[PDB]
């Protein structure tokens, strides 16, 4: 199934005419496999599966403002590192 490289696109909400607010969206890798024996001993809590997660984050961004005075972080270049808001 299709999912593009996560790259910069227009922001439908706050992009005013002539004020390009660029937010980058798309996909990277993810996988899950049963925990290996060499790794179970190192973990306090009994476990049955480990997972490798990857989400793309803006490794370069700059400050901007939009009508309303609220701070905005216009992303200039994002690449995919670990996932932050992913546990629940």
């Amino acid at each position: 199934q299709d999912c593009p490289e996560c790259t910069l696109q227009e922001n439908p909400f706050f992009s005013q005419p002539g004020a390009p607010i660029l937010q980058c969206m798309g996909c990277c890798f993810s996988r899950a496999y049963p925990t290996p024996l060499r790794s179970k001993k190192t973990m306090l809590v009994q476990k049955n599966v480990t997972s490798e997660s990857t989400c793309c984050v803006a490794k370069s961004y700059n400050r901007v403002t939009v009508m309303g005075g609220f701070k905005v972080e216009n992303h200039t270049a994002c690449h995919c590192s670990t996932c932050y808001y992913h546990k629940s």
Partner: peptide, 28 residues
């Protein structure tokens, strides 16, 4: 069998009053 691949991801540009956007990972 394991399972892996891609799927869309999101980061909220308006970091602040609005909450963070969850980002999923491929899983069983």
């Amino acid at each position: 069998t394991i399972c892996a691949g891609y799927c869309p991801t999101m980061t909220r540009v308006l970091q602040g009053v609005l909450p963070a956007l969850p980002q999923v990972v491929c899983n069983y």
